[PDB]
Ligand binder design. Structure first.
Ligand SMILES: *[C@@H]1O[C@H](CO)[C@@H](O)[C@H](O)[C@H]1NC(C)=O
Lengths: 49, 38
């Protein structure tokens, strides 16, 4: 099966690159939403608001 | 993960790995793995 896969290894490279781009895209998607601030603000112990 | 020593302290990571832990080159000097600092 692998001896016939060198004729479509280019297609496999395209699929692997597309999946890697999708994965890094999904990893970056969370950074643009929740990582708006670079300082973690602790909640005050006083709850009288 | 092999070749990288885990250290308990946390800095800002640069090379992502996944599951909230990265790897970086820090002091000689060798590659270490640590949890990210938000
Ligand atoms: C990091 O420090 C904590 C503090 O209790 C300790 O439990 C842990 O074993 C330390 N880890 C290493 C790799 O030194």
């Amino acid at each position: 099966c692998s001896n016939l896969l060198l004729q479509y290894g280019s297609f496999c490279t395209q699929l692997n690159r597309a999946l890697t781009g999708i994965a890094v895209e999904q990893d970056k998607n969370t950074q643009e939403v929740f990582a708006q601030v670079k300082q973690i603000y602790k909640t005050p112990p006083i709850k009288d608001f | 993960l092999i070749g990288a020593e885990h250290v308990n302290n946390s800095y800002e990571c640069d090379i992502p790995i996944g599951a909230g832990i990265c790897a970086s080159y820090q002091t000689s000097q060798s590659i270490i793995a640590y949890t990210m600092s938000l």
